Design a protein around this ligand. Structure first.
Ligand code: HEM
Ligand code: NA
Length: 333
């Protein structure tokens, strides 16, 4: 873990060369289109973001500080409807188990029955508590554990042939809000997305997700762009970030425009039968990205050719031409 970085204000976040090398570049082709891009979330490629179910990286402490600031300002970024309390404990069990197995240098868990002892050495936390007893922890169980893992989480109730957004911790969204979406069903919360409904992507995806079983989790990548390494690109805080989309120039694209990738996990939670949706968010500046000339060339092509409704949906419209012109320099054809 490097020195504390910000994702707001002075934007001190930056990637080491190792963090650049493992960035999850999301484009298998020189153009992008929506699809059901799901695969089994099996461990692969040691050192990569796909090695473990939950990826903890160099920015862990910085990010947890960012989460804490968001929640200090707005505790309503975390919501757990009462029927989802068991699912919140399932989520805390899954995260603590995997973190302690995969990063034993940073996390430890020992248990006897419902007497659990969790240590997070990175954050100086040493907690003895009662699994299932929310008065035993300093806050509600989903908030407790997600204050200690990178990325956002939604917890979906599966009922009546659908998924319902009935709990979550959403502090680094790509321009959406859990308080807006609370209680919505799968196709409903997806209503603003262009193209993909008519394509069948959401029908097919819902069907795959409803069939997810314990021990066979699934993953996909999503992406967008963000100006500055701003994690909290929420409706709630628009006045703090939306203006930056007018600040891109030919001279500053490389330092301002960031590629944002979401490594998404869908995992069945074993007591409750709920579905955990992890949204692990990676950021890389274009100066960093173009370190890799194959990434640079491919991003030029993607951005030049991206369907306008998809560009508009992603919020790239205002700076897209400047961006495209800048990236063209890295594309020998
Ligand atoms: C339960 C699991 C999922 C949750 C909770 C979730 C949630 C969301 C939310 C809240 C948005 C933003 C909508 C907005 O603009 O207000 C979104 C966008 C999107 N979702 Fe999902 N989603 C899930 C699963 C999937 C799956 C399996 C696919 C498969 C393709 C998918 C594809 C998309 C697409 C294509 C967009 C537009 C993203 C972009 O263009 O950057 N989602 N999702
Ligand atoms: Na294809």
């Amino acid at each position: 873990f490097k020195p504390l970085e910000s994702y707001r204000e002075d934007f001190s976040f930056r990637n080491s060369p190792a963090a650049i090398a493992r960035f999850p570049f999301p484009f298998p082709e020189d153009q992008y289109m929506y699809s059901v891009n799901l695969e089994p979330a099996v461990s692969r490629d040691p050192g990569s973001v796909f090695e473990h179910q939950f990826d903890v990286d160099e920015h862990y402490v910085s990010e947890m500080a960012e989460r804490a600031r968001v929640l200090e300002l707005d505790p309503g970024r975390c919501l757990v409807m009462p029927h989802m309390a068991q699912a919140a404990w399932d989520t805390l069990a899954m995260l603590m188990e995997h973190l302690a197995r995969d990063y034993p240098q940073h996390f430890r868990l020992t248990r006897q029955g419902d007497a659990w002892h969790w240590q997070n050495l990175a954050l100086g936390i040493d907690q003895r508590f009662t699994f299932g007893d929310p008065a035993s922890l300093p806050c509600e169980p989903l908030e407790y554990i997600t204050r200690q893992m990178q990325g956002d989480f939604a917890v979906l109730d599966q009922r009546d042939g659908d998924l319902f957004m009935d709990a979550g911790m959403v502090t680094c969204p790509a321009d959406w809000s859990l308080r807006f979406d609370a209680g919505m069903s799968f196709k409903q919360w997806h209503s603003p997305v262009p193209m993909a409904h008519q394509m069948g992507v959401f029908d097919r995806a819902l069907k795959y997700l409803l069939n997810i079983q314990v021990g066979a989790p699934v993953r996909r990548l999503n992406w967008t762009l963000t100006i500055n390494p701003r994690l909290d690109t929420s409706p709630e805080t628009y006045h703090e970030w939306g203006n930056d989309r007018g600040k891109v120039t030919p001279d500053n694209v490389g330092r301002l425009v960031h590629l944002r990738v979401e490594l998404q996990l869908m995992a069945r939670l074993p007591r409750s039968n709920a579905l955990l949706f992890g949204i692990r968010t990676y950021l890389i500046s274009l100066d960093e990205l173009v370190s890799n000339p194959a990434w640079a060339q491919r991003l030029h092509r993607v951005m030049r050719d991206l369907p306008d409704p998809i560009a508009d949906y992603k919020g790239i419209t205002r700076y897209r031409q400047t961006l495209v012109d800048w990236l063209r320099r890295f594309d020998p054809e």
